[PDB]
Amino acid sequence: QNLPQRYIELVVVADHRVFMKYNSDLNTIRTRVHEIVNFINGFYRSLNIHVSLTDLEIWSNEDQINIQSASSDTLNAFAEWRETDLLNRKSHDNAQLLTAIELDEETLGLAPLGTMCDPKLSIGIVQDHSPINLLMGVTMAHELGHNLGMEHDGKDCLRGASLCIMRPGLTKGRSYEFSDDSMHYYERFLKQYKPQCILNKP
């Protein structure tokens, strides 16, 4: 287990549909997100990654992109905007989108593989699908995981009593952990792609 200290500067963007859903109360969205970054961190402990929230942007007025049901299409719109608007203003390593649209083929999240630190592709879309901050943490941790070159595990993946975070579907539980495969998908990525943006302590 030779993994050096890495740091991710995360910016979560909450859409207009999220804004409406929590009765327009911003302090409610802030707290949820903050708790979620807390669960992510606990999961990434063994990987030696520390996830830091640099900015949380709530589209309280109007949606900056056309939020669609087709996950890959919204993924597309969010990439162009990250590059030309958010990254133009805020220096950040990764950007995740918190949408409340009921995603097409029952997709609860989507992110491209092995893309951490790419101007266009260092992103992910997470659907606000559970009132339990834990199942949302595993969700966002799952998508960040794909950014770090992690492929899926088996459906019957378990690590002790814990559920492997990189499973293809979401099963409810109380203990979730990353599998040895995930640790290996990341070890190779770090040596292969060698992400430059994740070394600075925020």
Add this chain to the structure above:
Amino acid sequence: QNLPQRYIELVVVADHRVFMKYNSDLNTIRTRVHEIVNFINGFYRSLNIHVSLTDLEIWSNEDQINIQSASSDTLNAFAEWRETDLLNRKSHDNAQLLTAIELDEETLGLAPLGTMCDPKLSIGIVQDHSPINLLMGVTMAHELGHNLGMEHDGKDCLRGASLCIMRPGLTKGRSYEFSDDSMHYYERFLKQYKPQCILNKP
């Protein structure tokens, strides 16, 4: 549960018996210890502790304390040496003595409980008992665990396929982890004692 980033400044002291074991070659002793620490770091990824090899003291000429079979006699003797001699020469957090003497009840390790940062009791004893750096790494990690307020786990403690590091006796294996209990023992340790010495990045 998220545990903060802590850093232990470790000094390993190899006695004359260890010096006479590796044919007076300091290089080999240096390479044995360097790898043992790497293994300690891997076990500690989960608890957010990084261990640094601050200095390696090899008593090449003669022992500075009376090395005795009685583990407890040697522990208390090494404790007062560390406080009056070593601490006043090398600023460090914890000091582990690597001895080559066959300890009393077939003892392979001994260290004080919940004593990290103490000028006298932030110590430990490790017997050079296995030519496999991994087992040597668990032995030193077990004793640093005691220093961090960790008490023993069950006779047959298992966190998945991995053997708990805090078992009262060493069973030869290929993967080791710290159990939930050990993670809670250290949590309480941090909250209760607020050790200052483990906050600076070396």
